[PDB]
Design an enzyme around this catalytic site. Structure first.
Site, PDB file in Angstrom:
ATOM      1  N   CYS A   1       0.622  -1.240   0.030  1.00 37.02           N
ATOM      2  CA  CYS A   1      -0.103  -0.019  -0.001  1.00 37.02           C
ATOM      3  C   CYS A   1       0.865   1.283   0.056  1.00 37.02           C
ATOM      4  O   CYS A   1       0.637   2.319  -0.734  1.00 37.02           O
ATOM      5  CB  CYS A   1      -0.996  -0.095   1.253  1.00 37.02           C
ATOM      6  SG  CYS A   1      -2.406  -1.115   1.066  1.00 37.02           S
TER       7      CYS A   1
ATOM      8  N   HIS B   1     -15.074  -5.434 -16.828  1.00 32.94           N
ATOM      9  CA  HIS B   1     -15.508  -6.179 -18.116  1.00 32.94           C
ATOM     10  C   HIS B   1     -16.483  -5.645 -19.044  1.00 32.94           C
ATOM     11  O   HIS B   1     -16.130  -5.395 -20.190  1.00 32.94           O
ATOM     12  CB  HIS B   1     -16.096  -7.591 -17.455  1.00 32.94           C
ATOM     13  CG  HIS B   1     -16.545  -8.374 -18.817  1.00 32.94           C
ATOM     14  ND1 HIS B   1     -15.769  -9.492 -19.649  1.00 32.94           N
ATOM     15  CD2 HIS B   1     -17.806  -8.585 -19.392  1.00 32.94           C
ATOM     16  CE1 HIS B   1     -16.619  -9.902 -20.621  1.00 32.94           C
ATOM     17  NE2 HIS B   1     -17.857  -9.104 -20.429  1.00 32.94           N
TER      18      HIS B   1
HETATM   19  S1  SF4 Z   1     -10.297  -9.840 -21.376  1.00 36.50           S
HETATM   20 FE1  SF4 Z   1     -12.561 -10.706 -21.860  1.00 36.50          FE
HETATM   21  S2  SF4 Z   1     -13.296 -11.700 -19.913  1.00 36.50           S
HETATM   22 FE2  SF4 Z   1     -11.594 -10.168 -19.101  1.00 36.50          FE
HETATM   23  S3  SF4 Z   1     -12.674  -8.264 -18.640  1.00 36.50           S
HETATM   24 FE3  SF4 Z   1     -11.875  -8.071 -20.931  1.00 36.50          FE
HETATM   25  S4  SF4 Z   1     -13.699  -8.889 -22.162  1.00 36.50           S
HETATM   26 FE4  SF4 Z   1     -13.966  -9.516 -19.918  1.00 36.50          FE
END
Ligand code: SF4
Ligand code: SF4
Ligand code: FCO
Ligand SMILES: [Cl-]
Ligand SMILES: [Fe+2]
Ligand code: NI
Ligand SMILES: [S]
Lengths: 481, 277
Positions: B15, B202
């Site tokens: 940290c 994602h």
């Molecule tokens: S690499 Fe694939 S599974 Fe991972 S956050 Fe990006 S789109 Fe999602």
């Protein structure tokens, strides 16, 4: 005529350390170091997918995570039977070596320099000991502060170098069993070399000179802190794919004698450590970690590693002494000018000065220089675009050991796999070798012994106790894990 | 510049290192212009009993007005003997003790890093020290001081610095009690500032097209496909790493390899194995 002093926390180290010394006639005559914090990575890891280890074990330490990453993936490589591509071997060296620069720069300026330099008149640079034994001129001292402040940006840039192929830092994503997860491109190799130039310049023009300069104002510090005068190196940074040629080659130095490194001769004692009595005396391949925090007589969560019964030290001093490389240009220059010493190779400092409080700061600066050339080489050796990784399957049952040198000294991880899960994982880390307690035979650890004879002419301003400790660049998170 | 004490329990000091990597503002500016870091054992000038005594003198002077950063988890087993952080008056100080002493008198507690926020690796399967998250340990002992979690293993420097500035600007505009209320309003259910942890990786990942096409990387070094089959936990992770990235913008985990969900409360076990979906 005996006075006991206790220092907890020792500050401007990593982690939790209590130092207790007995002072007699103005000098330390006994010492005990206590690593006060335990997490138990060696038990936490059991039962996991072995590939997880190369992420988990980085959380042993956020200052040297790339060293634990390296030891772990090397151990997994042997256990999995993975043949790391040549280009991945080089990428790993670029990832890891960049943190050697960060860690050494961090240590001298942001941990060590306040031992000798008075900082600005605000927290966290004040308050401090009334009689801090700060000897530098107003002009040199301000140079200290100017370089401290510059070092903040330089060490940040070192982590940019780490993250270019390592993903981020602290805690790289880019090293795994089988190699390195990201192929170096020509573009990012430029970004790496661009930053490397700035760090090289700071190292050659500022850091290495100032260590010799400041030391010359503290020549009494080369005459204390010798301890056992015994050193360990296990080898680090593979230079080929045979596993036999390395930037630092393994070796032991003890009682004036050079000897080869045989890992079967490592044992970990726990008589004075908070671990179950029945686990004492083990080699890492049979290592056990059973905490006993109430065990009488013990005073540390650090195990006591001994090499063939010897208590050794590790770190840049150990490595430069064992490897006895050529000293840097400006080191030869300033050893002549400022110390009246003629030297070509590191051992020309002689055993007494090298194994000293200030010698270990010198070894660390020289090693930082030494590493500049290794990295330059790998920047030429690397092949932009060539694959860096293989994708190996998890073995059902296997073992492996990974040996490397962390910025603070010898590091090994051993993993035993059973049923495709971690059955045992044992870590023998750098500050474990330095900051350990007495073994079952009553022999003190390396820093415990190196504290013997340290001057404390002013019991109310006992600055040399922690100055000696800081020369070893301790990391109690690494030592205990 | 408010007084700040930085206490380390079962931490790896990651940290503090990540904070040293702050770009805008630089760490020098943070220390010299934003906060008054009165106690921090990794970087402060003094040592031992005197450093603790200094912290107490400042804590007693600024009772109720100092900010307490906690790194690492708090081990409660064996009467706190698994984390001794200092000694004053020949009296060893455990993290349990130190947190009971200073916790009540802080304006606020910033639990930095997943260990302090949620327990993390020291609390994971196989451990035996009773590692406890800060917010839990304080509640268990009747301490009502507000806690802001800045998780990550480690956090991005911008998440730590950004949260401190966020709260200091709130406090300037609305005072101490009002400013802290405005801060709590911007925390999610896991205590995290939504400015930094309000978006899913994602849903904002640049490989989201490949994921939907079902185009998966099969080796780490394949930077075309989605990383999901290699173990990417982006789909279950709330952080802005896709945008601000890491270490001066030079990389981030999904580009380099995989996301391991280091900011989430179930790290590590709930995000493990790291290298399969
Ligand atoms: S690499 Fe694939 S599974 Fe991972 S956050 Fe990006 S789109 Fe999602
Ligand atoms: S990308 Fe995932 S693992 Fe990497 S720092 Fe962000 S949340 Fe943590
Ligand atoms: N460098 C570093 Fe960490 C320690 N000591 C390891 O190994
Ligand atoms: Cl490292
Ligand atoms: Fe160990
Ligand atoms: Ni370390
Ligand atoms: S370290």
């Amino acid at each position: 005529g005996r006075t006991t002093i206790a220092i907890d926390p020792v500050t401007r180290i990593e982690g939790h350390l209590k130092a207790e010394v007995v002072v007699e006639n103005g000098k330390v005559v006994d010492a005990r170091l206590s690593g006060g914090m335990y997490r138990g990575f060696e038990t936490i890891l059991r039962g996991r997918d072995p590939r997880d280890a190369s992420q988990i074990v980085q959380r042993i330490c956020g200052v040297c995570p790339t060293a634990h990453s390296t030891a772990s993936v090397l151990a997994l490589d042997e256990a999995f039977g993975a043949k790391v591509p040549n280009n991945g071997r080089i990428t790993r060296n670029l990832i890891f070596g960049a943190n050697y620069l960060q860690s050494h720069i961090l240590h001298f300026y942001h941990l060590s320099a306040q031992d000798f330099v008075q900082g600005p008149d605000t927290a966290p640079f004040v308050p401090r000991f009334p009689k801090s034994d700060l000897r530098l001129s107003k002009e040199l001292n301000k140079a200290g502060v100017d370089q401290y402040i510059e070092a903040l940006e330089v060490r940040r840039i070192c982590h940019e170098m780490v993250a270019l192929f390592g993903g981020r830092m602290p805690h790289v994503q880019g090293q795994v069993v089988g190699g390195a997860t990201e192929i170096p491109t020509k573009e990012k190799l430029v970004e790496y070399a661009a930053r490397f130039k700035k760090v090289r310049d700071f190292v050659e023009q500022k850091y290495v000179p100032v260590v010799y300069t400041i030391g010359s104002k503290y020549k009494d510090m080369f005459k204390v802190g010798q301890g056992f005068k015994a050193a360990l190196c296990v080898g680090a940074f593979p230079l080929d794919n045979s596993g036999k040629k390395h930037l630092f080659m393994p070796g032991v130095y003890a009682k004036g004698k050079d000897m080869p490194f045989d890992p079967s001769k490592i044992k970990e004692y726990v008589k004075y450590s908070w671990f179950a009595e029945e686990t004492t005396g083990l080699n890492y391949k049979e290592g056990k970690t059973i905490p006993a925090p109430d065990k009488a007589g013990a005073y540390s969560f650090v195990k006591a590693p001994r090499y063939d019964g010897l208590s050794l030290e590790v770190g840049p001093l150990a490595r430069m002494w064992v490897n006895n490389p050529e000293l840097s240009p400006v080191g030869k220059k300033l050893l002549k000018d400022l110390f009246g010493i003629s030297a070509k190779k590191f051992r020309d400092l002689g055993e007494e000065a090298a194994f000293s409080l200030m010698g270990r700061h010198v070894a660390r600066a020289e090693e930082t220089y030494y590493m500049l050339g290794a990295i330059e080489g790998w920047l030429k050796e690397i092949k932009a675009g060539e694959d860096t990784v293989v994708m190996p399957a998890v073995p059902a049952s296997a073992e492996g050991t990974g040996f490397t040198e962390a910025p603070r000294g010898s590091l090994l991880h051993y993993v035993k796999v059973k049923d495709s899960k971690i059955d045992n994982y044992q870590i023998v880390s750098a500050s474990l070798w330095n900051c350990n307690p007495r073994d079952d035979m009553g022999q003190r650890g390396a820093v415990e012994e190196a504290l013997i004879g340290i001057p404390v002419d002013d019991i109310q301003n006992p600055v040399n106790v922690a100055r000696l400790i800081r020369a070893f660049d301790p990391x109690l998170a690494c030592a205990v894990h | 510049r408010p007084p700040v004490f930085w206490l380390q329990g079962q931490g790896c000091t990651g940290c503090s290192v990540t904070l040293l990597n702050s770009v805008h503002p630089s760490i020098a500016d943070v220390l010299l212009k934003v906060i008054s870091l009165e106690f921090h054992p990794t970087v402060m000038a003094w040592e031992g009993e005197h450093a603790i005594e200094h912290m107490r003198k400042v804590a007693e002077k600024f009772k109720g007005k100092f900010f307490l950063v906690i790194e690492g988890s708090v081990p409660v087993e064996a009467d706190g003997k698994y984390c001794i952080i200092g000694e004053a008056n020949h009296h060893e100080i455990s993290m349990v003790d130190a947190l009971k002493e200073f916790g009540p008198n802080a304006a606020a507690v910033l639990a930095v890093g997943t260990c302090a926020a949620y327990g993390g690796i020291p609390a994971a399967e196989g451990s035996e020290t009773g590692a406890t998250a800060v917010s839990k340990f304080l509640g268990d002992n009747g301490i009502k001081t507000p806690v802001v979690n800045i998780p990550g293993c480690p956090p991005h420097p911008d998440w730590i610095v950004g949260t401190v500035v966020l709260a200091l600007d709130a406090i300037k505009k609305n005072g101490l009690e009002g400013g802290l209320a405005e801060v709590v309003k911007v925390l999610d259910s896991d205590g995290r500032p939504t400015p930094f942890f309000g978006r899913n990786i994602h849903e904002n990942c640049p490989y989201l097209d490949k994921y939907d096409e079902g185009v998966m990387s099969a080796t780490f070094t394949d930077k075309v496909g989605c990383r999901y089959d290699l173990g990417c936990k982006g789909p279950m992770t709330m952080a802005d790493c896709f945008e601000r990235k890491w270490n001066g913008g030079v990389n981030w985990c999904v580009q380099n390899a995989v996301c391991i969900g280091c900011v989430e409360p179930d790290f590590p076990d709930g995000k493990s194995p790291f290298y399969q979906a």
